[PDB]
mmCIF file with all atom_site columns, C-alpha atoms in Angstrom:
data_model
loop_
_atom_site.group_PDB
_atom_site.id
_atom_site.type_symbol
_atom_site.label_atom_id
_atom_site.label_alt_id
_atom_site.label_comp_id
_atom_site.label_asym_id
_atom_site.label_entity_id
_atom_site.label_seq_id
_atom_site.pdbx_PDB_ins_code
_atom_site.Cartn_x
_atom_site.Cartn_y
_atom_site.Cartn_z
_atom_site.occupancy
_atom_site.B_iso_or_equiv
_atom_site.pdbx_formal_charge
_atom_site.auth_seq_id
_atom_site.auth_comp_id
_atom_site.auth_asym_id
_atom_site.auth_atom_id
_atom_site.pdbx_PDB_model_num
ATOM 1  C CA . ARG Q 1 1  ? 3.865   -11.070 -7.463 1.00 37.55 ? 481 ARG Q CA 1
ATOM 2  C CA . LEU Q 1 2  ? 3.086   -7.464  -8.290 1.00 38.15 ? 482 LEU Q CA 1
ATOM 3  C CA . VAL Q 1 3  ? -0.233  -6.236  -6.929 1.00 33.84 ? 483 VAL Q CA 1
ATOM 4  C CA . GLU Q 1 4  ? -3.008  -6.017  -9.501 1.00 33.84 ? 484 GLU Q CA 1
ATOM 5  C CA . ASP Q 1 5  ? -4.658  -2.738  -8.518 1.00 31.79 ? 485 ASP Q CA 1
ATOM 6  C CA . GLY Q 1 6  ? -1.388  -0.800  -8.844 1.00 27.21 ? 486 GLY Q CA 1
ATOM 7  C CA . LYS Q 1 7  ? -1.802  1.237   -5.655 1.00 26.41 ? 487 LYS Q CA 1
ATOM 8  C CA . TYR Q 1 8  ? 0.156   2.050   -2.500 1.00 24.50 ? 488 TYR Q CA 1
ATOM 9  C CA . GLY Q 1 9  ? -2.197  0.985   0.274  1.00 22.56 ? 489 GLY Q CA 1
ATOM 10 C CA . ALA Q 1 10 ? -3.658  4.373   1.085  1.00 22.02 ? 490 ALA Q CA 1
ATOM 11 C CA . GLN Q 1 11 ? -7.093  4.296   2.837  1.00 21.01 ? 491 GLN Q CA 1
ATOM 12 C CA . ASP Q 1 12 ? -10.192 4.344   0.643  1.00 18.50 ? 492 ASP Q CA 1
ATOM 13 C CA . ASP Q 1 13 ? -12.846 6.537   2.257  1.00 17.01 ? 493 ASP Q CA 1
ATOM 14 C CA . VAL Q 1 14 ? -15.821 5.005   0.391  1.00 16.17 ? 494 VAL Q CA 1
ATOM 15 C CA . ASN Q 1 15 ? -16.821 3.102   3.520  1.00 19.39 ? 495 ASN Q CA 1
ATOM 16 C CA . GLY Q 1 16 ? -13.430 2.295   5.015  1.00 22.43 ? 496 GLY Q CA 1
ATOM 17 C CA . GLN Q 1 17 ? -11.692 0.334   2.252  1.00 19.59 ? 497 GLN Q CA 1
ATOM 18 C CA . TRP Q 1 18 ? -7.991  -0.215  1.755  1.00 18.57 ? 498 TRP Q CA 1
ATOM 19 C CA . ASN Q 1 19 ? -7.300  -0.106  -1.988 1.00 16.29 ? 499 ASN Q CA 1
ATOM 20 C CA . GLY Q 1 20 ? -3.660  -1.004  -2.464 1.00 18.10 ? 500 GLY Q CA 1
ATOM 21 C CA . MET Q 1 21 ? -0.985  -3.101  -0.807 1.00 15.72 ? 501 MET Q CA 1
ATOM 22 C CA . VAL Q 1 22 ? -2.975  -3.333  2.396  1.00 15.93 ? 502 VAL Q CA 1
ATOM 23 C CA . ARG Q 1 23 ? -5.992  -4.922  0.725  1.00 13.88 ? 503 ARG Q CA 1
ATOM 24 C CA . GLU Q 1 24 ? -3.755  -7.924  0.037  1.00 17.00 ? 504 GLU Q CA 1
ATOM 25 C CA . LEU Q 1 25 ? -2.628  -7.763  3.662  1.00 16.69 ? 505 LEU Q CA 1
ATOM 26 C CA . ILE Q 1 26 ? -6.149  -7.763  5.078  1.00 20.98 ? 506 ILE Q CA 1
ATOM 27 C CA . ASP Q 1 27 ? -7.702  -10.484 2.943  1.00 21.72 ? 507 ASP Q CA 1
ATOM 28 C CA . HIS Q 1 28 ? -4.692  -12.830 3.433  1.00 24.68 ? 508 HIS Q CA 1
ATOM 29 C CA . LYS Q 1 29 ? -4.376  -13.015 -0.351 1.00 23.52 ? 509 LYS Q CA 1
ATOM 30 C CA . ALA Q 1 30 ? -0.694  -12.111 0.051  1.00 23.05 ? 510 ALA Q CA 1
ATOM 31 C CA . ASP Q 1 31 ? 1.296   -12.380 3.271  1.00 20.90 ? 511 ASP Q CA 1
ATOM 32 C CA . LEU Q 1 32 ? 4.289   -10.116 2.590  1.00 22.57 ? 512 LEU Q CA 1
ATOM 33 C CA . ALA Q 1 33 ? 4.771   -6.634  1.179  1.00 25.95 ? 513 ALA Q CA 1
ATOM 34 C CA . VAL Q 1 34 ? 8.500   -6.052  0.624  1.00 23.78 ? 514 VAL Q CA 1
ATOM 35 C CA . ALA Q 1 35 ? 7.567   -3.016  -1.400 1.00 24.81 ? 515 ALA Q CA 1
ATOM 36 C CA . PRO Q 1 36 ? 7.201   0.773   -0.817 1.00 26.00 ? 516 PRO Q CA 1
ATOM 37 C CA . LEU Q 1 37 ? 5.758   0.456   2.696  1.00 27.54 ? 517 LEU Q CA 1
ATOM 38 C CA . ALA Q 1 38 ? 6.508   3.579   4.696  1.00 27.38 ? 518 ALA Q CA 1
ATOM 39 C CA . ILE Q 1 39 ? 4.847   2.894   8.063  1.00 28.51 ? 519 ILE Q CA 1
ATOM 40 C CA . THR Q 1 40 ? 1.640   4.873   8.403  1.00 26.76 ? 520 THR Q CA 1
ATOM 41 C CA . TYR Q 1 41 ? -0.135  5.039   11.760 1.00 27.54 ? 521 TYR Q CA 1
ATOM 42 C CA . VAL Q 1 42 ? -3.556  4.282   10.268 1.00 27.67 ? 522 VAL Q CA 1
ATOM 43 C CA . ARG Q 1 43 ? -2.045  1.280   8.526  1.00 29.60 ? 523 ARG Q CA 1
ATOM 44 C CA . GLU Q 1 44 ? -0.855  0.034   11.933 1.00 29.50 ? 524 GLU Q CA 1
ATOM 45 C CA . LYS Q 1 45 ? -4.491  -0.301  12.959 1.00 31.09 ? 525 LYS Q CA 1
ATOM 46 C CA . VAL Q 1 46 ? -5.391  -2.792  10.223 1.00 30.70 ? 526 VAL Q CA 1
ATOM 47 C CA . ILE Q 1 47 ? -2.072  -4.390  9.280  1.00 31.29 ? 527 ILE Q CA 1
ATOM 48 C CA . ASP Q 1 48 ? 1.274   -4.560  11.055 1.00 33.79 ? 528 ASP Q CA 1
#
């Protein structure tokens, strides 16, 4: 399944949001991301 928001994770500074891949990996709406997923240190805090 392609993600619906069409974004690469990439922290959303509105209040702390996570508009991309990692939104699917917080909300348990998708449990894998074999995708462009260069490990970012701030992503390590909220996903693994």
